[model samples]
Target chain A: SPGIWQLDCTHLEGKVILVAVHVASGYIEAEVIPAETGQETAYFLLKLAGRWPVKTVHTDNGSNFTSTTVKAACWWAGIKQEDGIPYNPQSQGVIESMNKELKKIIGQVRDQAEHLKTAVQMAVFIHNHKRKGYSAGERIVDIIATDIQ
Target chain B: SPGIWQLDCTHLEGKVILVAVHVASGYIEAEVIPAETGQETAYFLLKLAGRWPVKTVHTDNGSNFTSTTVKAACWWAGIKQEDGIPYNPQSQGVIESMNKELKKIIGQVRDQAEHLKTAVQMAVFIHNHKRKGYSAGERIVDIIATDIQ
Candidate 1:
């Protein structure tokens, strides 16, 4: 199974949210970080570390994705970081679609400041827990563990 | 391929050495930290984030490895943290052997304080670059990328 994930970032109430969408399973992982810098994104990758079998990370051509720090982080994690067409979501449809939906969910919250983090968490949990096929809701983690083992 | 890593700690001239051995590749990644604690080990795992496809992390049943911080770190990273036989290197033979050799290499160097870090780097580099088939010397990173792709 090629576990390809698309990476992207967005802002909600001034909070920077980094996101990764697993193309095959629709599994999405997002986090609110201090800034959209290479270091933060690199750290996010670590946060994504044992979540799934992250074989490759596809992202648009942005400094946050192209910086040496992120590249080194990917290199160190044995993840193939693929830089997609710049500024073109068409080239990275899954994550672009994910970001749009995630932002909409985050925007619908009552208190953006007090609940921004909670909103993002709720959105991701719902997204991953969808009662659908082998989507993110499928306890993909256990399946990945068993598959890899 | 199962990229299981064994985590351990050792001392070199007062410097706490954190080591992770890729059981299959025989490739070693070691770093000199201030102390052998959960936080330090957690940070080390992030450093290992992009090094290889770290499927599972096997460690001895030490307080440092069993702490909540390390567990949470592994959980977020999606890495399975397996607690091995307590204080018994035989159950964790590969990393144990790796640690012994690494310490010896660092010990043989003169000016332990000045050269400890460098020695560790050199040893890890050499270890990963050995002339063996499908080994760390085999540019395993690229192979992993293609394999996953």
Candidate 2:
């Protein structure tokens, strides 16, 4: 399943950002941006590619991703772009499961606002490293290599 | 919660059709096609709307619905179309819950191949009209209408 993260925009005065994750690998990346525009998405793509080797990017047909600049960046990066079918979400199985995982963790840490960040980070780390039969009993890093292969 | 149908195309020789129902009003619609094409979807929309008074239609961002033909049909029919956010099934709560109900009925009728369809239809009928309570004996239908409005 994909990793999930919620940006703490409330603390940052409501700045827009992209919180993306690798569904199979459980790697998360967050980028705080002034606005969610095509140029910003292109910049994020560059940064994302530098941080991780992504083969497929799945997202809704948001204006940011549909723009020429972002599409060009995806093509240049050799990344395949997949959009969820409108009104059907089962295609993106991993990320849907991840949201539940994030929700459970958030519920437990709801009372401790100051510790929410650390709690979520720990939850994500554990989720990636935990030995689950579905994940082939390996860490998320290993899962990434397997998926890439 | 909305209704969900887990369509099994293996048994059918032609199109794979998934039907989502609004359990309260016995309102149902089907999405059908041989290859899930836009043209086939246009036909499905006509059939679906003919069967039910569709005020709102929910689906995932499948290419078929996003295509010009299906979108045009919605415009012509005066139906409000809503889609699940990419990678999120929570938004399609009704359908997901209905899928579970269908699965239970299917399991019960596993041995009676000929009766499976009939059994499913009966189960759906019962779900809609049953005197189920919501929040301290309030009728489920009333609760749903109140919340929906």
Candidate 3:
């Protein structure tokens, strides 16, 4: 009764970052692929679930997201693919906003083009652990201290 | 251009945990409120951003979510309240799933009903850094060590 998925692709020019945010827990996984196509997106999705498991996926109807190739791969993997209402892209609102901020963070270090991926990694780390509350009891919240941020 | 928010209020019988997850990075913050009314939810939201920042707030149009009072609070906060489509809770799918898992974890410890809030806090920690991929670089894959989970 409680599993859902959301996927979205964000990119600028030569770089495409495919982000998959599990609709629960605000947990996110991202990959900077070679292009904005289903192959890499599907490839990244597959590798991501290599450790955990996903039942179905929810996403907008982007070419790479809804094309027949992606359906086939998901089919073979035994995953269901569902689409949000047409033209209502806000359905995928969570990651759309994420992509925007990610773009901003990347823009901050654009001159260090080589380290874009590293920077994303660091930002995600800061995000996963930064205190959503005080920093005394939990491991994730405690991974980094409030003073650190 | 840069705005996103995720909110959910989960409760058992005597308590409510209000959680807000920032869209981009799955960053999250949560709290236990005395009740689940529009005013309490709105007040909790204001306090959450006092520690961070947000521009747009997205939530299911629950009784507590869609009221004129809450709308005004969001307006005062300079934030926008976007609704997930009716019958399409997928828009708020992230927290729907989170609430379920949180419920399951709390059920495991039902004897300590008094500690449910603290328990939810701890579960969120594990949710943040548990392994999705093997120990590696800065990818969501490496936020935590492998053997930890």
lDDT winner between 1 and 2, please give it.
Answer: 1
lDDT of 1 at B129: 49
Cα misplacement distance, residue B108 of candidate 1 (Å)? 18
Clash statistics: count for each candidate:
12, 20, 2
Name the better of 1 and 2 by DockQ: 1
* Top-scoring candidate (lDDT): 1
lDDT of 2 by residue, B40-99 (tens): 554445434422234566554467447787676566455565554534555356556655
Docking class of 3: incorrect
lDDT of 3 at A119: 46
lDDT per residue as tens, model 1, A29-136: 777776788867775664464334477887644785659978876775568888756466465565566778777766664353254655676567556655664436
Model 3 ranges off by over 4 Å: A86-92, A107-113, A134-149, B1-149
lDDT of 3 by residue, B46-118 (tens): 4443333456777745675567767755764566787645355564576677778767865664563245554
Chain A TM-score, each candidate? 0.79, 0.58, 0.70
What lDDT tens digits, residue by residue, belong to model 1 across residues B8-97?
Answer: 788767788788766655656777787878866765664464334566888744785678877865765567888655466464566666
Candidate 2, residue A125: Cα displacement in angstroms equals 2.8
- List the candidates ranked by TM-score, beginning with the highest: 1, 3, 2
User: For residues A60-100, what per-residue lDDT tens digits would candidate 2 score against the true structure?
Assistant: 44674477876865675556665544354553565556656
TM-score of chain A, predicted model 2, versus the true chain A, to 2 decimals: 0.58
